[PDB]
Each structure stands twice: as C-alpha cells, then as structure tokens.
Swiss-Prot record:
The active site is at 40 (charge relay system), 84 (charge relay system), 177 (charge relay system). PROSITE patterns: TRYPSIN_DOM (PS50240), TRYPSIN_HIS (PS00134), TRYPSIN_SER (PS00135). Residues 1-221 form the Peptidase S1 domain. It comes from Bos taurus (Bovine). This is Serine protease 1. Keywords: Calcium, Digestion, Disulfide bond, Hydrolase, Metal-binding, Protease, Secreted, Serine protease, Signal, Zymogen. GO terms for biological process: digestion; proteolysis. Interacts with SERPINA1.
C-alpha cells in the first residue's frame, strides 16, 4: 500500500497472509474454511496465516492453517488477468473470534463513488522498495467505468473495476495482490493489477467480486 496508514493490530479481521516460506499475497476469509484470493497468486504449498499484524513476529492471535485444495477460476486468463480469482480451502476450520472473522460476500455490485477499504503488506513506495511488517490500510473510491477504460484502453473487462486516485500518490502495490477491497461491509474487490504503483492516471485495477458470487457459492457447496 502506497500512501496509506497503519491499520492497527487485528482491525481488519478478515485479512489473511498467504505464506510459502514468506509472505507473497493477501486474501480474504469468507467463512471458517474458505479464503478467496487472486488467481495470479496461485502456487502449491500454501499456508494461510490468520490473525496477523506483524508478519515477522508471533504476537499471540495468529492461526496458521495449511491449504488442502486450491481452485483457480475456470476461465482465468494469465495474459489479460481476466477472471483473476481463486478459492483456497483450509485443512481445518479457523476459530472465529473478534480478531479473526469472515467478510460477507456482496448481494449487489458497488457503484462508482463508493468509498472502500484496501489493505495489505505490499510495497509502500512508488519508486524503490520498502516492505512493511505491519498491515497497511487505504481508503479509496471506486472510479467510473469510463475513467477506468480511459486510463487503460483495451484492457478493462466487465470483470474489473478501478479504484483509487487519478492524481496518483495512493494505491495498492506489489505484495498486496489477492487482498480485499471492502465497501460497506462487503467484499467487492480483489487486488489484481496496475501499471506501476500510485502513478498519475494509472489507478489500481480490481477483480469485480459481485460477478462471481454464484460460482463461489456453488464451489463451496460441493468441495
Ligand atoms: Ca505475527
């Protein structure tokens, strides 16, 4: 997260860290046994870390649970990043409490102008590299589809939306991928891609979760 603020320990209780020996992507807990993330975060050997603030220090509220199954969306396209969503099943159910909690799926899509919360442990600089150890937060609005398509000609599908600031300075970034965009208490986006980070006229692009609710619910029901 570039240009954000320190969330505070366990104030984003649905945020997860995907660990393969190190943090490499975010995700969101959607019930006691399932996480949603970005398909471009796919790899084998994932451990899901819940209840994290400082990902390099054991602070006492963590739960570490290995993945038993990962399901990349059937139509994921790694070249365009269309359908950049995957589901991860945990080997055992998480213990839900005030600091580890699921985020509701949306019943309706969010409109441009809605303010959302984006969070992650990704890079905090637009030029250079500095990775934080505590969770960072950003409040950002959903941008109009017209402005999104104008920023990224020929690259925005109906399964994507832009959020952030056309003036630059505030954005998600590398290492935030897979993490949540929460608007009015519902999961509306997944950190997916962008051109650099926090650059003028290049806002972040997010997977549009409301398009996938039926697939998520059907998949969870049968796996
Ligand atoms: Ca920790």
């Amino acid at each position: 997260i570039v240009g954000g603020y320190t969330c505070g320990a366990n104030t984003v209780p649905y945020q997860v860290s995907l660990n393969s020996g190190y943090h490499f992507c975010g995700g969101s807990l959607i019930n006691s046994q399932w996480v949603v993330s970005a398909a471009h975060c796919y790899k084998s050997g994932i451990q899901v870390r819940l209840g994290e603030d400082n990902i390099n220090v054991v602070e006492g509220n963590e739960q570490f649970i290995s993945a038993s199954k990962s399901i990349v969306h059937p139509s994921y396209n790694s070249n365009t990043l269309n359908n950049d969503i995957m589901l991860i099943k945990l080997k055992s159910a998480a213990s839900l409490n005030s600091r580890v909690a699921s985020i509701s799926l949306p019943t309706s899509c969010a409109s441009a102008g809605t303010q959302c919360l984006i969070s992650g442990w990704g890079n905090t600089k637009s030029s250079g590299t500095s990775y934080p150890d505590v969770l960072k937060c950003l409040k950002a609005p959903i941008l109009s589809d017209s402005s999104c398509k104008s920023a990224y000609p020929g690259q925005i599908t109906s399964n994507m939306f832009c959020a952030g600031y056309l003036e630059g300075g505030k954005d998600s970034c590398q290492g935030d991928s897979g993490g949540p965009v929460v608007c009015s208490g519902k999961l509306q986006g997944i950190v997916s891609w962008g051109s650099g980070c926090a650059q003028k006229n290049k806002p972040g692009v997010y997977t549009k979760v409301c398009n996938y609710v039926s697939w998520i619910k059907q998949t969870i029901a049968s796996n």
